[PDB]
Amino acid sequence: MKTLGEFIVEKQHEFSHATGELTALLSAIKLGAKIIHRDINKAGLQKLDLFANEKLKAALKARDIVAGIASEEEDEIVVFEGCEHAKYVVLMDPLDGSSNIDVNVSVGTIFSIYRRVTPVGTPVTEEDFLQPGNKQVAAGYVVYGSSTMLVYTTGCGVHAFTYDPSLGVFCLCQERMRFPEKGKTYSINEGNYIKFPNGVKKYIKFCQEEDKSTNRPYTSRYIGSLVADFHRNLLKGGIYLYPSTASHPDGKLRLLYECNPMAFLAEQAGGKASDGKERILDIIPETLHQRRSFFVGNDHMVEDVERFIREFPDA
Amino acid sequence: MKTLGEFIVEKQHEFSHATGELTALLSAIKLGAKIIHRDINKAGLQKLDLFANEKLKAALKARDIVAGIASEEEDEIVVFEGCEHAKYVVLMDPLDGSSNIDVNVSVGTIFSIYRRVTPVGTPVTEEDFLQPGNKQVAAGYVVYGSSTMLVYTTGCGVHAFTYDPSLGVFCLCQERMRFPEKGKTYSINEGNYIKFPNGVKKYIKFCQEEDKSTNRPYTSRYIGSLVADFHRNLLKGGIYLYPSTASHPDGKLRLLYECNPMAFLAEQAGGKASDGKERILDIIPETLHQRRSFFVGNDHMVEDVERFIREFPDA
Amino acid sequence: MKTLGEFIVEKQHEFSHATGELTALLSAIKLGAKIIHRDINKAGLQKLDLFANEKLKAALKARDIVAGIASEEEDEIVVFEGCEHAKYVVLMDPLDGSSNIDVNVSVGTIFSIYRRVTPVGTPVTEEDFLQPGNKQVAAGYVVYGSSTMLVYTTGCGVHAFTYDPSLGVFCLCQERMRFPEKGKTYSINEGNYIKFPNGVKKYIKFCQEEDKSTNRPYTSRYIGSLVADFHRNLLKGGIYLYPSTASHPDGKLRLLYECNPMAFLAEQAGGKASDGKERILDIIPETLHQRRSFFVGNDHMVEDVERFIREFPDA
Amino acid sequence: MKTLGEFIVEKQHEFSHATGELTALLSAIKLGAKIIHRDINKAGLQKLDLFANEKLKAALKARDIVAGIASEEEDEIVVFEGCEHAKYVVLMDPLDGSSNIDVNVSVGTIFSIYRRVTPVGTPVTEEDFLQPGNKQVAAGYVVYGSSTMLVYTTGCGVHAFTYDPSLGVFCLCQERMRFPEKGKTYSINEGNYIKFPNGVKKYIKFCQEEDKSTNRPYTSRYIGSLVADFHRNLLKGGIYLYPSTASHPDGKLRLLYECNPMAFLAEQAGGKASDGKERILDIIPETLHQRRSFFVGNDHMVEDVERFIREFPDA
Ligand SMILES: O=P(O)(O)OC[C@H]1O[C@](O)(CO)[C@@H](O)[C@@H]1O
Ligand SMILES: O=P(O)(O)OC[C@H]1O[C@](O)(CO)[C@@H](O)[C@@H]1O
Ligand SMILES: O=P(O)(O)OC[C@H]1O[C@](O)(CO)[C@@H](O)[C@@H]1O
Ligand SMILES: O=P(O)(O)OC[C@H]1O[C@](O)(CO)[C@@H](O)[C@@H]1O
Residues A50 and A183 in one domain: no
Q: Which of D154, D176, D198 is where one domain is finished?
A: D176
Nearest 10 degrees: Cα torsion C245, C251, C253, C255: 180
CB-CB contact of B42 with A164 (8 Å): yes
| B35 vs C266: CA distance, rounded Å | 34
CB-CB contact of D165 with C163 (8 Å): no
Classify residue D123 by burial, with Cβ atoms within 10 Å: 0-12, 13-18, 19+: middle
Cis amide linkage into residue C249, ω under 30° from 0: no
| B33 vs B66: CA distance, rounded Å | 17
Residues forming beta bridges with residue A170, ordered by sequence position: A163
Classify residue A266 by burial, with Cβ atoms within 10 Å: 0-12, 13-18, 19+: buried
- Helices C198-208 & C299-311 angle (0-180, nearest 10): 130
Q: Which residues of A touch C166 (CB under 8 A)?
A: 165-166
Q: Which of A147, A193, A220 sits opposite B104 (nearest CB)?
A: A147
Contacts of C143 (CB under 8 A, 6+ apart): C106, C108, C149, C151, C227, C228, C231, D104
DSSP C218: P
Classify residue B233 by burial, with Cβ atoms within 10 Å: 0-12, 13-18, 19+: buried
Angstroms from A207 CA to nearest CA on chain B: 7
Residues A184 and A312 in one domain: yes
Residues B198 and B129 in one domain: no
Residues B116 and B239 in one domain: no
Residues D143 and D286 in one domain: no
For chain B, where are the E strands, in sequence order? 66-71, 78-79, 88-96, 107-115, 138-144, 148-153, 159-164, 169-174, 185-187, 219-220, 239-242, 272-274, 294-297
C54: how many CB neighbours lie within 10 A of its CB?
15
CB-CB contact of B290 with B250 (8 Å): yes
State the number of CA atoms in the 13 A half-sphere of C299 facing the CB: 9
- C191 and D231: CB-CB below 8 Å? no
DSSP B182: -
Whether the CB of B258 sits within 6 Å of ligand 2: yes
Residues D42 and D101 in one domain: yes
Nearest 10 degrees: Cα torsion B233, B239, B240, B241: 180
CATH number at residue D304: 3.40.190.80
**Torsions phi, psi for A192 (to 5 deg):** -90, 20
Ligand nearest to the CA of B143: 2
- Helix or strand or coil: residue A315? coil
| A100 vs A96: CA distance, rounded Å | 9
Angstroms from B167 CA to nearest CA on chain C: 6
CB-CB contact of A89 with A65 (8 Å): no
User: How were these coordinates obtained?
Assistant: X-ray
| Ligand 4 centroid from CA D225, angstroms | 6
Q: Does A166 touch chain C (CB under 8 A)?
A: yes
Pairing of β B294-297 and β B239-242: antiparallel
Contacts of A118 (CB under 8 A, 6+ apart): A124, A125, A127, A128
Q: Nearest to residue C296, comparing CAs of C247, C250, C261?
A: C261
Q: Which residues of B touch C163 (CB under 8 A)?
A: 168
Classify residue C102 by burial, with Cβ atoms within 10 Å: 0-12, 13-18, 19+: middle
- Closest C-alpha residue for ligand 4 atom 3: D189
- Helix or strand or coil: residue C17? helix
Q: Nearest to residue B62, comparing CAs of B40, B96, B38, B86?
A: B86
CB-CB contact of D169 with A168 (8 Å): yes
**Torsions phi, psi for B213 (to 5 deg):** -60, -20
CB-CB contact of D104 with C143 (8 Å): yes
Closest atom, ligand 4, to C-alpha of D229: 16
- A168 and D34: CB-CB below 8 Å? yes
Choice from C48, C92, C99, C196 to test ligand 3 binding pocket (greatest atom count within 8 A of CB):
C99
Disruptive mutation site among D22, D83, D167 for chain A (greatest number of A CBs within 10 Å): D167
Q: Nearest to residue A188, comparing CAs of A216, A215, A207, A213?
A: A207
Residues A84 and A191 in one domain: no
CB-CB contact of D243 with D275 (8 Å): no
Q: Does C166 touch chain A (CB under 8 A)?
A: yes
Contacts of D126 (CB under 8 A, 6+ apart): D77, D288
Residues D161 and D198 in one domain: no
- Closest C-alpha residue for ligand 1 atom 3: A189
Q: Nearest to residue B156, comparing CAs of B312, B13, B314?
A: B13
Q: Which of C157, C176, C195 is where one domain is finished?
A: C176
Residues A142 and A218 in one domain: no
CATH number at residue D100: 3.30.540.10
Q: Does B166 touch chain D (CB under 8 A)?
A: yes
Angstroms from D284 CA to nearest CA on chain C: 32
Resolution (A): 2.2
Q: Which of B131, B160, B176 is where one domain is finished?
A: B176
Residues B216 and B105 in one domain: no
CB-CB contact of C237 with C298 (8 Å): yes
Residues B89 and B172 in one domain: yes
- B220 and A42: CB-CB below 8 Å? no
| C110 vs C72: CA distance, rounded Å | 10
Q: Does D207 touch chain C (CB under 8 A)?
A: yes
Buried b (16+ CB within 10 A) or exposed e, B197-216: bebbbbbbebbbeeeeeeee
Q: Nearest to residue D203, comparing CAs of D73, D93, D300, D61?
A: D300
**Residue-range definition of the domain harbouring residue A112:** 2-176
- Helix or strand or coil: residue C203? helix
Element (H, E) at A304: helix A299-311
DSSP A256: I
Residues B149 and B216 in one domain: no
The gap from C-alpha C285 to its chain's centroid, in whole angstroms, comes to 17
Residues forming beta bridges with residue B209, ordered by sequence position: none
| C148 vs D146: CA distance, rounded Å | 8
Angstroms from B52 CA to nearest CA on chain D: 21
Contacts of B58 (CB under 8 A, 6+ apart): none
The number of distinct structural domains making up chain B is: 2
